[PDB]
Write a protein that binds this ligand. Structure first.
Ligand SMILES: CCCCCCCC/C=C\CCCCCCCCCCCCCC(=O)N[C@@H](CO[C@@H]1O[C@H](CO)[C@H](O)[C@H](OS(=O)(=O)O)[C@H]1O)[C@H](O)/C=C/CCCCCCCCCCCCC
Ligand SMILES: CCCCCCCC/C=C\CCCCCCCCCCCCCC(=O)N[C@@H](CO[C@@H]1O[C@H](CO)[C@H](O)[C@H](OS(=O)(=O)O)[C@H]1O)[C@H](O)/C=C/CCCCCCCCCCCCC
Ligand SMILES: CCCCCC
Lengths: 198, 202
């Protein structure tokens, strides 16, 4: 469990990194090597933010410290630089995981094919990543969906019943959603969000 | 350039690793983020072979030493393990680069769609990797060719900064290919002789 947001809504870097380093394996529960590059991309971001943090933990104590310090340090290159860029991408993946799991927990599905995960992953993708992907990467997303597991199999890998698995997940989603929201609002407030497409 | 093959055809782990270290950036010359995971995968292999070798340059002096030693270390798990597995996959990416450049150089081409490299990448894929990829990854490869550059850009990017003609670029590549092609053929031969090749698919 991620720690809850303090009153001031600031996120301490070290403990954020520690918690989110546990999430790349989420993609291993999908059950196919097709999803390895996704895990590697999210891990990459985390590694890079950690590297910046470790150069000076006091100065980069919060995620906000990271953005404001880097903004001065890189001037006209910022925000397409350093840990600011890595976190800009990381939050999108983290949002995918949030929308995806929330959707599953809320019982969104295709009534004709309730044990697929297509409508949920497609929803998450739409809300988290689609806007930042060119048409070629979107066609790759579509191919990758044919590697998706059965919902029941994914929930089994995420592990002690299935009805509770969903409840553990709902409990996880509280502070996770709240933290991700704060990070997005931070990017918006600092005009650190970019829109280029891969 | 890669060191030449000696008489004994034993490939020295340290130089080889140093030479192939220059190759992952090849994929950056393709000009799209779509090829990044391929860069990362080949780099991964190189790094893993280095981590095993660094533990004892002497015991792992040769590529053939890696296979011999690991065979003993890991028993029934081998060859699906360590640097042997890493190089099993590395060789396939290296052969992709071999076949693809070789093709380009030799011509080939389509010319109902004249200056797209779909045909050269495709030959290279078929001959090096397709057999080890299941239908989803192959479908992914198909979508990824849409991101492939035109020929000239590619060559432009390969020599980038040095100031060369297309013709000059090509012959530089041809020169490179001699100890590279020879070296990759020897690695493939070693895997066959040591019964270290696996055929599982991704
Ligand atoms: C069903 C489940 C599927 C859900 C998948 C949704 C999540 C995937 C999203 C990954 C995030 C993303 O879109 N990344 C994108 C942008 O990355 C960012 O790029 C930035 C530069 O512009 C930075 O480099 C950044 O890293 S940093 O640390 O240096 O700052 C890095 O995170 C990234 O390009 C996408 C990664 C997913 C892989 C997609 C492409 C795979 C194509 C492979 C083609 C293989 C060719 C043939 C195969 C035989
Ligand atoms: C034109 C250019 C076309 C490129 C053609 C060459 C493609 C080369 C691909 C690399 C070779 C390959 O197929 N690798 C494969 C096997 O890797 C090996 O797997 C082993 C485990 O069985 C080991 O982990 C091994 O690493 S080791 O160091 O631990 O031993 C590792 O190298 C690897 O799975 C393929 C990597 C290329 C990307 C494949 C598909 C990515 C699709 C991602 C979809 C993302 C969907 C989200 C869209 C936003
Ligand atoms: C480099 C991408 C810019 C997006 C902001 C409008």
């Amino acid at each position: 469990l991620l720690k809850p947001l303090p009153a001031d809504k600031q996120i301490e870097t070290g403990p954020f990194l520690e918690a989110v380093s546990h999430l790349p394996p989420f993609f291993d529960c999908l059950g196919s090597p097709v999803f390895t590059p996704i895990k590697a991309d999210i891990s990459g971001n985390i590694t890079k933010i950690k590297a910046v943090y470790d150069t000076n933990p006091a100065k980069f104590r919060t995620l906000q410290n990271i953005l404001e310090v880097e903004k001065e340090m890189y001037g006209a290159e910022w925000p397409k630089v350093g840990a600011t860029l890595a976190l800009m991408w990381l939050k999108r993946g983290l949002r995918f995981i949030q929308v995806f799991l929330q959707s599953i927990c809320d019982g969104e599905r295709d009534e004709n094919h309730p044990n697929l995960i297509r409508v949920n992953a497609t929803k998450a993708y739409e809300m988290a990543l689609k806007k930042y992907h060119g048409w070629i990467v979107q066609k790759i997303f579509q191919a990758a969906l044919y590697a998706a597991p059965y919902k029941s199999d994914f929930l089994k890998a995420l592990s002690v019943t299935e009805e509770e698995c969903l409840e553990k997940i709902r409990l996880f989603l509280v502070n996770y959603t709240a933290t991700i929201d704060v990070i997005y609002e931070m990017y918006t407030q600092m005009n650190a969000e970019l829109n280029y497409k891969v």
